[PDB]
């Protein structure tokens, strides 16, 4: 009888995508992983394991946290990986992962959202669909998937003011 | 940049909305435009309306007109949003057209209207836009977080899903 | 505190939801419970399910059973969520029952299902809960941000609204 | 031919109810008035004039701002008034308005939301429905309408930690 394969694993490191309002803080905190909400209603043929690695706010996120993400991605059986993450340091994590030889036969995609998923008008659900497809279809490597396109982490910056990733032009 | 994408809308469950005059759902404005409005896209996209007919009412003549319309696009990356009832019929017909052989054509839609809570539509649109950009030339169905070969796929009406034959 | 409120659910557009098996809307779980879950209430509320029938299918016998059910409540403040097609018929029938004469009974619902985008349901529920707490004993329809006298009201099916006669 | 009366006027002073995410701030700001969004889809028989008075964040809100709200409410022709406002100083504004003899024949209700309207799971739409009804049905006075009940501002406090208004018990 046919067994539907589950080629994709998702890891979550928090970020804007997962932010939610809490009364105590009178403001946003990093909440539960929004990617789980999106996949719950995606009516998937397979299944996707979603493993939560970290929810630190961006200021507290360290090298040691980035090392733990590399160990988790490297230890996964799956060769197709989506990491949801904050956009302010996504490029630094992507560049770090691109240097691990352990990742050489894996397609690893980083994504997230400029607007929290739990806020009206969020990019999150589109971005998760696009990034899931990217993780399945791209050749091995490390990529950022945002704005409905694929970015090379070595040639990308975050424009903090505009909430967009932009290519670094070759000179 | 990504390659320019052309999106055609042929109606279906994805676009259904409630109307007081009908006391129920009717095919309304294309939901894909609502999703892409907030997707903060970098690439070139253009959305064109083909139809708001029920996909069950499509004739062979209708499918021939959808094929000619996809062939009017310069773009080589195409998304067609469509009802799931006859998505396999339209997809198999397009896959037979030599005039489309250099294009990546992806059909998608939703099992639950985009304007109803808990819909698959926004995820499906993201997934299918990536698929239209990234897959080799051909015709495909992108639903349920996977890519289907139309020749080897059927719509299970009772289970609300696509399945391998 | 406010006086305890009892809420009865009799179905209707407010509670409609999409089902793949029907390829369309059916009366689902009461939407009023979804609204009150996030309303952070201070007062006593209890929600009881009466029916998920189409309001057009209500008989005189059904309206008599709704009257007896409202009379089983100790509470003197009652909200009944209901379809708009026969809301005036149920409301006029309840207004004729001496056994309800000390109760404030408010009927409400929605023109657009709560689970569809752009629905009036959550505003209607807030408004009707206030109305059930604050109005003098009687039977009322609370819709469109106002209070209607059932005896002097009709459902315009074509315009999707209630109106004075 | 029948003219539908419009007995209710709404004023907006910002608060949590109106908060929205902005990329530049990387967080919530006081946005456009959420009550307008709720009434847009309420299918009203009448109309409601919605007048925006202030969007200051809570720290910048002063006595002079509170005085301007009292002048706007007193000058309105309508005798049924809903003021949407922050919950942290709603009691102080309500007590201030309760002391204006100019308001004596008006029903004035203050409301808002513990969770921004543009965040998932908000109380805002319910609260606006309830508070509109309260403004129409209550006898003249100044009230807070939250948690599906009516509070007397002289006998109410905000519990900041729990996001709730509570009665001050008579001793
Ligand atoms: Cl914030
Ligand atoms: Cl329907």
Residue numbers in the entry:
A (entry chain A), D (entry chain A): 1 to 171
B (entry chain B), C (entry chain B): 4 to 168
Text lifted from the article:
L‐Asparaginases (ASNases) catalyze the hydrolysis of L‐Asn to L‐Asp and ammonia. In contrast, the chain of ASNase from Rhodospirillum rubrum, reported here and referred to as RrA, consists of only 172 amino acid residues. RrA is homologous to the N‐terminal domain of typical bacterial class 1 ASNases and exhibits millimolar affinity for L‐Asn. Crystal structures of the wild‐type RrA, both with and without bound L‐Asp, as well as structures of several RrA mutants, reveal topologically unique tetramers.
A distinctive feature of RrA is the presence of Lys19 within the lining of the substrate‐binding site. We probed the importance of this residue by mutating it to L‐Ala, L‐Glu, and L‐Gln. Crystals of RrA(K19E) were isomorphous with those of RrA(K19Q) and were obtained only in the absence of L‐Asp. The kinetic data, even when reduced to approximate turnover numbers, demonstrate that Lys19 plays an important role during catalysis and its mutation reduces the rate of catalysis by two or more orders of magnitude. Further studies are necessary to explain the differences between the activities of the K19A, K19E, and K19Q variants.
